[PDB]
Design a binder for these strands. Structure first.
Ligand SMILES: [Zn+2]
Lengths: 358, 94, 97, 85, 109, 98, 81, 109, 94
DNA sequence: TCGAGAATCCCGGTGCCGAGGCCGCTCAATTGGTCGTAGACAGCTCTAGCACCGCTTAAACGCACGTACGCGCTGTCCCCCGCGTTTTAACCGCCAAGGGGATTACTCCCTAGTCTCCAGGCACGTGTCAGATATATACATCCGA
DNA sequence: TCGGATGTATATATCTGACACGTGCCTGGAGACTAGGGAGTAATCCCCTTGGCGGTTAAAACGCGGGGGACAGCGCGTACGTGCGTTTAAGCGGTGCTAGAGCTGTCTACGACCAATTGAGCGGCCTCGGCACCGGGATTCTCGA
């Protein structure tokens, strides 16, 4: 059927991106070596591996990539910003030796503006020293914290570099009810996952001039990668001595559906792949059995996912999987009329054999 | 049966705010109880001696602040002093 | 035969005993010693068990500290062994004699 | 059976001294550490137990409760945490 | 008509009790008359210090995959710092162990 | 030929002389200046009663003399007669001040 | 303000202090360490004395203040009050 | 008619005052109520200790032909004993000097 | 003019019984004064802590006797205890 | 084992300033009662310390071997001592000005003391989950050839 | 440099007991009120801290020659680490007793408190003799021949 052909095409797409991805990894690794050799406050920076396959990355053009550089910081303190904990403020507790980041403080709070400014400056200095491949830094885009590399070898590649802080302390109290897979992968696996650090990525809120450049959101890219690659109740699920399921195939179909609709209808700009991943996480929790995801029944499983999403559209409610009070479908994030538009598009595609996949 | 008073419940409450999923074994409860008692004793004794040197006869917040500034070594003094001042202000406001 | 060279089992035993937390003196001999010493000051005394435990813990801590400082002197005097001159010097510096 | 006792200081065997030393971070123990260690232990125990027994005798009792030993230790700058307070 | 009871710990936004500390101050013979502002300050300081110890011990306990806290973890938390180790430089912790430490000259060539 | 004691005799004569008197061994005015300099860092425009400076001087003298006694013991322990900085650092480490 | 006063503790003064202690042959590197040790000790004592005076609302660090600061660290001093 | 005054130090056969010690005990916040037998005991103990120090110092002063007592003599009296030196093992005496003492190895052959 | 209290006269009286022809210089008076104050402080503090451990609320002679037995090292304890008992008996007789 | 020299002890005489005693006087210690509670003492209950017995086996004891470290002896060379001569700043004596400590009055508000009433915290009981334990691996480290 | 031997970290499966949580109840903490004494504030007194000038000699600073002590190297011997085999007694589980810790209930004596009275001790004078200092002589201890 059309769906299997689409899967084949999606899979064949990795070949056209593999060489660019390799050049990107080469450049990034050179940059990391440079950053680790020089003496500065970013000496401990490292690449966070978040996956490079179509399933792991956000929707992107085939020659656009993103990487996260993680940094270590001692004993931070988090102050909630909203009522749902969508944003967080970072402050510092007692340090005996003296805070090495003292001169980046603004009042009691760490200034993201200063850190990104220094990060960008350092990147510009080191990228100037890469002599064998033409790598420069794109002019800073006001409103985007990424430092964007432009690589010309000889075709133009864009790499958005996002600085991410890493904290080894306790997980925030808001996430107490998050990750409800106690019945899906057992309690011990949940505990082992919750015994791991968490990440903070700079993000401005859309709430006035005050505190702009001083707000951060949580990142759990490691746990999500782990769950994606270890997703069965059976230890051998999707392994070489186990049986395949269609969980990732369904994810790919819905992500590609959204990608094509967003391409066709710029009305859909405010939707992203994170909504799809959250929805499918909820479905994987509701239907934990591998037999509820047989590849033979891929299309039927996809349809049962579609119906849930339409109801998610209709109630304007989609709780963040890690932060239950964080409603991804709030009025403020996505206008009701955009969701009604998406509903109409989804019903059209479902009733006409998905012509947008053509 | 005479029946005693300790600091078990309060220490447990404070623990449930900075590590929302760990427990604590009874031996550690005994240790923390004794530690709280000892610090309270040291601070109160120092405050009493201070109030007696200046011929005063009362303990205001100011003597407690000076005693804390004398015992705790280093930056702990600064942090604890700030915490105390904030708490007493928030109490007096209402 | 697989004899280790001298100076290896000692380092292994350090790496092990500096990691556990149990008690290192047998119990009953220590209890007998405590009662023997107590008899001189007063006759027919009865001890609670926790009192004996407290005495044992304090004694272990004291002895461990003393041996650490003795080792420091012994290294300072260009040696590796420890001999009673070291212990006497440590106790005389600390102010207990 | 109020049987008096004698020569129990030999109960602190040789391997016990050895293990106590190993915890401290030593590598070669000479052959005359043992007598000095036994003497030092005897002195320390005498000093603690005398004050413990005085604290008991003051209150008209015959049982040396652990809280008394904690007080006796605390009086010499060796505060002990974990046995009541 | 009496207004509804409202504990002083509530009005101060603390966790340690304040009535109990006030009673202890009054009936311990520290001074003739205890001001009304001292107990709040003292409770705040005690709470802060206990928060410090518990947080550091909790980190060290989660380090080696244990849910609870046992005296070894408390000893590890106290002995590593630079100020806490100076405030408690005379205190023995039962069943505490010691810090791993081997001198530099003993190690073989 | 001029008369000259062999090395190591005036030392013992001066030990015998100094272990017997009582007056102070640090010049007054330099110590007063040093005390004021150190107090400058915690408050501004302080005023010291004279007896306070005297008390500080006596305490410092006693502390240093004790330290040198213990250092000399450590030095003689290691088959020497000359004190060196490692001796002082060892003495302060054992005594518990570090 | 004042600067470079630690060089007021001359070398003969340290020689005399050592001689009272019972020392025979002082090396040449002792002075640079004795000065540091003395500086640390004075810093601690003076900090405690100034805290007492600041609390009492005065501007004159009297002898009793220094005696109390000394007594706090277990170095009691008889002979001034 | 009131009987003639007779101080408590007289009825106890002491020399240190007893009324003054009783006042100090009451107004120092040591306990709620001071028994009536404590001050006599405490004054007796203080008198005995002062007698010890003064007698030893006086002997040492008459040793080297001086009529009065100066701090050097007090330091000599205290530092020679075996128990007094242990009761005052932490106390510095202003203008006290030290005990004559030279090690055994420094002396020439 | 406020006007202070010390132990000069009493120490001088005690000196005039064990050395009937020697004097004492003012510095030694200061030293002896401070020494008396310090010993009194130590003994009283120990007695207070003892009286508080047993839930009592008063200071009898017995607590002072136990405190003396705890502080003074060695045979000084025996001699001072005998002196105290003799004095208190002679006082209570009349 | 002795002269020669340099440093210390002994001793006789002078000057002063600090210890010792005297005189008001005022404020704390005594005498004399009253009372309301804390400590003394008897009597009862029930926990916890002591004494004992058999056994299962982990730790202590004893002996052999030999290798690495403690100790003593020699040589050497550079750093610290002793002394003389010059140069600097501590000391001592005397003014001179004024910030600040110490004392007095007075008046007001904050804390002690009571009485009532109601909820926070402690003793008790219970059920299940974290950790201790046993067994089989898989990997890291030391030692001779 | 390598392979063999040993020791340690890891994953899995199973039990069991202690800790996290309800539940009932009780006593001490909070609310409302009243009284009075400590402390805060303003004003005045005078003392003792800072500041400076100028002369005097004691001590610091610099430089020089050389005797001796720190240090490295080597060689030798005994004594303490390692391992194996044997013998002692420590845990451990379980009884069984009773001494004394702890609690409750009366009831008497004694320490706080108050009021009037008066003499011990403190501050402020005076005064002379114990000691610091000078200067000369005798005694002793160190060094080279
Ligand atoms: Zn699968």
């Amino acid at each position: 059927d059309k769906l299997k052909k689409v899967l084949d095409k999606l899979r064949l797409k990795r070949k056209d991106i593999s060489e660019a991805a390799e050049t990107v990894n080469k450049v990034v690794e050179r940059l990391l070596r440079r950053m680790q050799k020089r003496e500065s406050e970013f000496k401990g920076v490292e690449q966070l591996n978040t996956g490079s396959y179509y399933e792991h990355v956000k929707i992107s053009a085939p020659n656009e990539f993103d990487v996260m550089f993680k940094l270590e910081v001692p004993r931070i303190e988090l102050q909630e910003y909203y009522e749902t904990g969508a944003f967080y403020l970072v402050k510092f507790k007692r340090i005996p030796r003296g805070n090495p980041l003292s001169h980046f403080l603004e009042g009691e709070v760490l200034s993201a503006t200063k850190m990104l400014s220094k990060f960008r400056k350092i990147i510009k200095e080191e990228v100037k020293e890469i002599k064998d491949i033409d790598v420069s830094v794109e002019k800073e885009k006001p409103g985007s914290p990424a430092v964007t590399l432009l690589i010309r070898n000889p075709e133009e590649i864009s790499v958005d570099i996002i600085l991410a802080l890493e904290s080894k302390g306790s997980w925030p109290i808001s996430t107490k009810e998050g990750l409800p897979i106690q019945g899906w992968l057992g309690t011990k696996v949940r505990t082992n996952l919750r015994r791991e650090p968490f990440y903070l990525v700079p993000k401005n809120a859309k709430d006035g001039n005050s505190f702009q450049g001083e707000t951060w959101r949580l990142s759990f890219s490691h746990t999500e990668k782990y769950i994606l690659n270890n997703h069965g109740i059976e230890k051998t699920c999707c392994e070489s001595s186990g049986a395949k399921c269609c969980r990732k195939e369904c994810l790919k179909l819905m992500k590609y559906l959204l990608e094509q609709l967003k391409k066709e209808f710029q009305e859909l700009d405010a939707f992203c792949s994170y909504h799809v991943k959250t929805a499918i996480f909820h479905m994987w929790t509701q239907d934990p059995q591998d037999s509820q995801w047989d590849p033979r029944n891929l299309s039927s499983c996809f349809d049962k996912l579609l119906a849930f999403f339409l109801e998610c559209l209709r109630t304007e409610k989609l709780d963040h999987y890690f932060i239950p009070k964080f409603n991804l479908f709030s009025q403020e994030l996505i206008d009701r009329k955009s969701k009604e538009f998406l509903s109409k598009k989804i019903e059209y595609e479902r009733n006409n054999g998905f012509p947008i996949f053509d | 049966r005479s029946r005693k008073e300790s600091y078990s419940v309060y220490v447990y409450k404070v623990l449930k705010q900075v590590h929302p999923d760990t427990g604590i074994s009874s031996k550690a409860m005994g240790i923390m109880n004794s530690f709280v008692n000892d610090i309270f004793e040291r601070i109160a004794g120092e405050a009493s001696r201070l109030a007696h040197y200046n011929k005063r006869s009362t303990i205001t917040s100011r003597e407690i602040q000076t005693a804390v500034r004398l015992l705790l070594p280093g930056e702990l003094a600064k942090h604890a002093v700030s915490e105390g001042t904030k708490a007493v202000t928030k109490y007096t406001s209402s | 035969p697989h004899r280790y060279r001298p100076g290896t089992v000692a380092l292994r035993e350090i790496r092990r005993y500096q990691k556990s937390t149990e008690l290192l003196i047998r119990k009953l001999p220590f209890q007998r010693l405590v009662r023997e010493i107590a008899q001189d000051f007063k006759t027919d005394l009865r001890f609670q068990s926790s009192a004996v435990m407290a005495l044992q813990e304090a004694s272990e801590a004291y002895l461990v500290g003393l041996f650490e400082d003795t080792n420091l002197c012994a290294i300072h005097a260009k040696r590796v062994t420890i001999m009673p001159k070291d212990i006497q010097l440590a106790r005389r510096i600390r102010g207990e004699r | 059976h109020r049987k008096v006792l004698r020569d129990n200081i030999q109960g602190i065997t040789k391997p016990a001294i050895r293990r106590l030393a190993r915890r401290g971070g030593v590598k070669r123990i000479s052959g005359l550490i043992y007598e000095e260690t036994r003497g030092v232990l005897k002195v320390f125990l005498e000093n603690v137990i005398r004050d413990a027994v005085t604290y008991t005798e003051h209150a008209k009792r015959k049982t040396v409760t652990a809280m008394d030993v904690v007080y006796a230790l605390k009086r010499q700058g060796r505060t002990l945490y974990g046995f009541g307070g | 008509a009496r207004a509804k009871a409202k504990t002083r710990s509530s009005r101060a936004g603390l966790q340690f009790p304040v009535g109990r500390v006030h009673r202890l101050l009054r009936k311990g013979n520290y001074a003739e008359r205890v001001g009304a502002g001292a107990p709040v300050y003292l409770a705040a300081v005690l709470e802060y210090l206990t928060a410090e110890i518990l947080e550091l011990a909790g980190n060290a306990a989660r380090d080696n995959k244990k849910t609870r806290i046992i005296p070894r973890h408390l000893q590890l938390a106290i002995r590593n710092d630079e100020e806490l180790n100076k405030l408690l430089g005379k205190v023995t912790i039962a069943q505490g162990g010691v810090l791993p430490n081997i001198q530099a000259v003993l190690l073989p060539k």
